[PDB]
Amino acid sequence: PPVPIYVKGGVWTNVEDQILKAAVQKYGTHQWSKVASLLQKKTARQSELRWNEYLNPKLNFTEFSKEEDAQLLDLARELPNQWRTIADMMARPAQVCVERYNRLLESLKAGDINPNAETQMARPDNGDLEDEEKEMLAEARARLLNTQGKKATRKIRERMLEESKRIAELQKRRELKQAGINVAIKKPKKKYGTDIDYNEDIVYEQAPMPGIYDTSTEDRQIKKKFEQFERKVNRKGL
């Protein structure tokens, strides 16, 4: 129901630059197809060009100093029109270098495809938005939200369902207790032959290896306190 966009080179707007930035923060630099899937009407290579040429904060967009500018005239003299090598020598993007070289030596129609669109300035947007851009930001927030797998999401669901299942299981017992028939709570079943129930025994009980001092009366005081707590939970209910 969208007709297919076969050629996806366009003009970079503001929306796509900002979604590319908030996608590179989460997805990282070397996954480009997963970045460019987040914003339609652009390609994984054109996302890579828009990062490495324009949106990168390491890139040097300032005015040229006088030593920089004389260095540019000399390097453009020595290396004839090898602009990637020159731009590597200046730590500046190559499009900046070419346009500033044109400004030194000086002293698009409609219906054309612009090849240099990734290196050029963005277009700010009309005031409300377009509808497809509303859809783009909605699905982009939806894909930047999730940090879980299938197993973990199913675990969230299973914990909630077991919780509500226990609540219903206690509800019926409280109703039958009001009626006067005391159904004891059934236990979960063991999945294997030596699966351990944890109210029968202290399961790996380690005694504290007695010393020189005497602990009879403190034992009696603890035993009194615990017996009284269990009786109070039986009568009054915590």
């Binding site: 969230i156 909630m160 509500s164 299942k165 609540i167 219903a168 509800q171 009001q178 009626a179 006067g180």
Partner: protein, 300 residues
């Protein structure tokens, strides 16, 4: 604040309802194997008791013509009572213990019964070919909790232990609407608002959600009460601006339907909680609450 109380039932009241249009006499089925009527006027005493089943009583309803009503109990059995003379028209015995019953508005003879083996049996008083059983429903997976018919008479709702809600047409056995979420919880009570644009459910997470009664059924939130333990009824004003609920701590909560603001919060004598809360449609600003304490409290 509460005015007067009834000597309701030893060991608690498990259901009480009013007459749907006039409300001049109320009834409660109790934990002590008895179903009793009372008058809401002129005497405040018990007009007509009758022994019902052998086990305690789980639920009650009304045929809308009100000559007869329903009874369902923990002895795996359902009976139909003539409310005037007192005699029985049908007795029915089930496989599992029946959780809730409901009767159709249009005909008194259609009724639906929902058991704790994930089935909704749809009997009929008139036809007797297969013990009245017109149709059974089986799209729920677990023991269902409550089921509430529409006032229009065509479709109806059920809720179940497996945290989903389904909506059926009258005898199709196909759920036309499944209300299921991820973070949902099961609701032991359903009711339909008198404006009929919404029905609301008392969910297990101590809230009340509300859905449309028009098509494309979709989901305000009524919070401020703790009802996670027991499963508690809710009623509405006879004008349709107030909703009233009970609680596990023996106090009722009244919200304004128009804005979802908790207006007042009135406690009730008796330590035991309160589940069944019913409103009088004719006389405004009159509620009756009751619970596991056993007495029947007439709140303002």
């Amino acid at each position: 604040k509460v005015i007067r109380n009834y000597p309701g039932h030893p060991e608690g009241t498990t259901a009480l309802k009013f007459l749907p249009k006039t409300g001049h006499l109320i009834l409660s089925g109790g934990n002590d194997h008895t179903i009793k009527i009372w008058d809401f006027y002129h005497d405040y005493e018990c007009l007509r008791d009758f022994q019902g089943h052998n086990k305690p009583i789980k639920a009650l309803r009304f045929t809308e013509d009100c000559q007869s009503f329903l009874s369902s109990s923990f002895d795996r059995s359902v009976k139909i009572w003539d409310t005037e003379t007192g005699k029985v028209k049908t007795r029915l015995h089930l496989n599992s213990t029946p959780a809730d019953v409901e009767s159709r508005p249009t005909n008194p003879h259609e009724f639906i019964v929902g058991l704790s083996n994930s089935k909704i049996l749809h009997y009929d008083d008139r036809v007797s070919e297969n013990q009245g059983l017109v149709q059974t429903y089986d799209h729920h997976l677990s023991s269902i909790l409550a089921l509430k018919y529409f006032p229009d008479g065509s479709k109806f709702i059920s809720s179940s232990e497996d945290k989903t809600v389904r909506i059926w047409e009258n005898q199709i056995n196909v759920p036309i609407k499944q209300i299921s979420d991820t973070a949902q919880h099961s609701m032991p009570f359903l009711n339909v608002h008198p404006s009929q644009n919404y029905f609301c459910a008392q969910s297990m997470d101590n809230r009340i959600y509300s859905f449309s009664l028009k098509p494309k059924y979709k989901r305000k939130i009524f919070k401020g009460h703790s009802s996670a333990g027991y499963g508690i009824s809710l009623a509405f004003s006879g004008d349709g601006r107030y909703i009233c609920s009970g609680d596990s701590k023996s106090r009722l909560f009244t919200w304004d339907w128009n804005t979802s603001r908790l207006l007042n919060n009135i406690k009730i004598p008796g330590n035991k909680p309160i589940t069944q809360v019913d409103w009088h449609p004719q006389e405004t600003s009159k509620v009756i609450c009751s619970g596991a304490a056993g007495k029947i409290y007439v709140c303002d």
